[PDB]
Amino acid sequence: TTALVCDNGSGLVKAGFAGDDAPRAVFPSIVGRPRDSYVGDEAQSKRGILTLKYPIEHGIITNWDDMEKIWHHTFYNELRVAPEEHPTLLTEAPLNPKANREKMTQIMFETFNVPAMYVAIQAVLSLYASGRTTGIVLDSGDGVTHNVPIYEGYALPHAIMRLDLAGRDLTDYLMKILTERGYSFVTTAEREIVRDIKEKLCYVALDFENEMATAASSSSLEKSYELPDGQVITIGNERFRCPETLFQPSFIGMESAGIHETTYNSIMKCDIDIRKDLYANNVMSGGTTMYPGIADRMQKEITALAPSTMKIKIIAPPERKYSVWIGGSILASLSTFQQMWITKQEYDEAGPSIVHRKCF
Numbered sequence: 001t002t003a004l005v006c007d008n009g010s011g012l013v014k015a016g017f018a019g020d021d022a023p024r025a026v027f028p029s030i031v032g033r034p035r036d037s038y039v040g041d042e043a044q045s046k047r048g049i050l051t052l053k054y055p056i057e058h059g060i061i062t063n064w065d066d067m068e069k070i071w072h073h074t075f076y077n078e079l080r081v082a083p084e085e086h087p088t089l090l091t092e093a094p095l096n097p098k099a100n101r102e103k104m105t106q107i108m109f110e111t112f113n114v115p116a117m118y119v120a121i122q123a124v125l126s127l128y129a130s131g132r133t134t135g136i137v138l139d140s141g142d143g144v145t146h147n148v149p150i151y152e153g154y155a156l157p158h159a160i161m162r163l164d165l166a167g168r169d170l171t172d173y174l175m176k177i178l179t180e181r182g183y184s185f186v187t188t189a190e191r192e193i194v195r196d197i198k199e200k201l202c203y204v205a206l207d208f209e210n211e212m213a214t215a216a217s218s219s220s221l222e223k224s225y226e227l228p229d230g231q232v233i234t235i236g237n238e239r240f241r242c243p244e245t246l247f248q249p250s251f252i253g254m255e256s257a258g259i260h261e262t263t264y265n266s267i268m269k270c271d272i273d274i275r276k277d278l279y280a281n282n283v284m285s286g287g288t289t290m291y292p293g294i295a296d297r298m299q300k301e302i303t304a305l306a307p308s309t310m311k312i313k314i315i316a317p318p319e320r321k322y323s324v325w326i327g328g329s330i331l332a333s334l335s336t337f338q339q340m341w342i343t344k345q346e347y348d349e350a351g352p353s354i355v356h357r358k359c360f
């Protein structure tokens with residue numbers, strides 16, 4: 001019997017089979033009901049006649065009925081499996097409450113009748129995907145950014161940092177600044193294009209000011225882009241200005257500190273002991289960390305932030321968009337992991353609190 005790895009995100013569901021090198025299903029974490037309900041991409045196209053909702057906010061599940069619907073659709077329509085024949089690894093946000101996590105367990109067992117499940121912290125899986133059990137994870141997704149410092153495979157809860165700004169915000173901002181340029185991107189259809197420009201053409205500048213200086217001088221940083229109506233459009237300084245929001249959340253009117261600073265502050269909240277280890281083990285995770293240049297930029301910013309003698313390293317795996325899912329695939333496939341599943345039997349005996357004595 002194969003295991004299913006199912007990574008729930010604010011914006012995207014990543015789901016598939018343990019042992020695969022990537023998720024078979026990737027789709028909007030969206031439920032739509034009329035103004036008898038619809039999931040993912042169907043929900044989006046039919047948004048004119050539905051109330052679209054997000055069951056996961058900032059990585060935390062907040063609407064249980066819609067989450068149930070998401071999972072149903074995942075098992076039955078996306079992966080086309082019988083959930084009662086498959087151990088299921090689910091993933092969770094950092095600092096997910098005990099009540100939440102227990103509720104996930106109950107639903108799997110009572111609603112979906114799985115024979116076994118597990119719940120693993122997403123940052124741990126990412127860090128595990130990179131062959132590490134110690135380090136600090138920057139997980140930037142669609143709806144939230146976390147810094148998660150992990151030591152010997154255990155996340156340090158007092159040092160976790162949250163920044164309420166990620167992918168969907170960068171998309172909205174890119175819409176906004178392209179519209180300043182002279183285009184118009186206001187409509188949902190137009191949001192999807194901006195999303196595609198963003199993932200294709202954006203990048204983090206090594207020195208921000210210096211980049212504006214180059215961009216206000218020549219075409220050397222401009223790129224063309226062809227639209228779905230056939231129109232070609234020039235995009236210039238908007239390429240590095242959009243992802244710069246990650247370092248300067250004040251660009252979208254946010255008081256919060258940037259990702260370099262939140263990373264730094266996270267490490268600062270840890271033992272001197274292990275602070276040295278975290279610095280040489282910054283691992284970047286999630287769709288929003290995909291920008292070219294992101295590695296070097298973070299590299300630089302931590303260097304100027306941290307003691308001058310300190311050795312610092314940033315790890316950006318090519319596949320880090322699904323590296324949480326991948327970590328799950330490796331984990332759920334291991335010889336030794338097989339003893340860690342919470343079986344339906346163990347659940348009937350213990351109840352949902354059993355879920356907490358995990359290692360991941």
Ligand SMILES: Nc1ncnc2c1ncn2[C@@H]1O[C@H](COP(=O)(O)OP(=O)(O)OP(=O)(O)O)[C@@H](O)[C@H]1O
Nearest residue numbers: 009010011012141142143144167199286287288290
């Ligand atoms: N090449 C890319 N460059 C920049 N952003 C990207 C790229 N590919 C995907 N993204 C963005 O990453 C986000 C989705 O990533 P991910 O699945 O890691 O987040 P999530 O798990 O859905 O949300 P969260 O982690 O906040 O709950 C989307 O906003 C998407 O636009």
Ligand SMILES: [Ca+2]
Nearest residue numbers: 008009010141
């Ligand atoms: Ca995520």
